[PDB]
Write a protein that binds this DNA or RNA. Structure first.
Length: 209
DNA sequence: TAACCGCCAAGGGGATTACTCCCTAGTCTCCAGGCACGTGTCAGATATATACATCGATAACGGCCAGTTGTGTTTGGTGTGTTTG
């Protein structure tokens, strides 16, 4: 389809922009909530072998406080992305000092690809998202409360306040969709704020592991 | 003084005889005694037989050891599939 594909692309882009904004990267208040009309008028609304073709709508955004830190958002055309594509992406990334990135794959990448992805991990952080997982922004959902990634200093402050070993805090595996959304990694604590029906508000913490 | 011798006397009684009674030695027969067998009995010795006793063998009895409906999960391998080298 044409119209549906354009709608899907616009939704994916909006989701990614909201995600980057949540993480901390600075983004236009315009593109954060741009409707679909300007999207059509910008790209062409002819994804079917036309102007709005993938890999052309990628967006690079720099962090809020560290203008030196950016992250790509690729959109490979291969339904079953291989390793060669990620290989060339990483090579082309290597020219700049960028370290983080985000891959949007049509369909699930082959298992051989995940091995390569993790292999380059310490040097170039890159993670994957299925468009099917990006068509909706979970963090807005009624059930999913509000997360706040904590800085190391305050994590130490918390642990020293409650005299509690970080091993004793609750756990949240990295695979969790909220974790992958925020880009948290192992050994890092996420603050959770829930409306408590018996206490108004209740704040808890979860160490990723 | 009486043993002995002599003359004298009566008659006892010893020997003989004819004759008779009836005794007794002898014979055939057959009893009393005595010493030998014959049958029977009691007592004893030798022998066969039944019974209780010691000892030996089989072996019955005591006793041991032997064999004789359903729901809800996990893991782990095979076949197909895709990508990689």
């Amino acid at each position: 389809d044409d119209e549906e594909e354009t709608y899907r692309l616009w939704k994916i882009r909006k989701t990614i922009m909201q995600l980057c904004h949540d993480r901390g990267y600075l983004v236009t208040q315009d593109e954060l909530d741009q409707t679909l009309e300007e999207f059509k008028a910008q790209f062409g609304d002819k994804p079917s072998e036309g102007r709005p073709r993938r890999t052309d709508l990628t967006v690079l955004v720099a962090h809020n406080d560290d203008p030196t830190d950016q992250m790509f958002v690729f959109f490979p055309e291969e339904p079953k992305v291989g390793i060669k594509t990620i290989k060339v992406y990483c090579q082309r990334m290597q020219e700049e000092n960028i370290t983080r990135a985000l891959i949007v794959v049509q369909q699930g990448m082959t298992p051989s690809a995940k091995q390569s992805l993790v292999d380059m991990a310490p040097k170039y952080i890159l993670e994957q998202f299925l468009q099917q997982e990006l068509l909706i922004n979970i963090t807005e959902h009624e059930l999913v409360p509000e997360h706040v990634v904590m800085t190391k200093e305050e994590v130490t402050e918390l642990l020293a306040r409650y005299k509690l070993r970080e091993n004793q805090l609750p756990r949240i595996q990295a695979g969790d969709p909220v974790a992958r959304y925020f880009g948290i990694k192992r050994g890092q604590v996420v603050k959770i704020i829930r409306p408590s029906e018996t206490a108004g508000r209740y704040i808890t913490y979860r160490l990723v592991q």
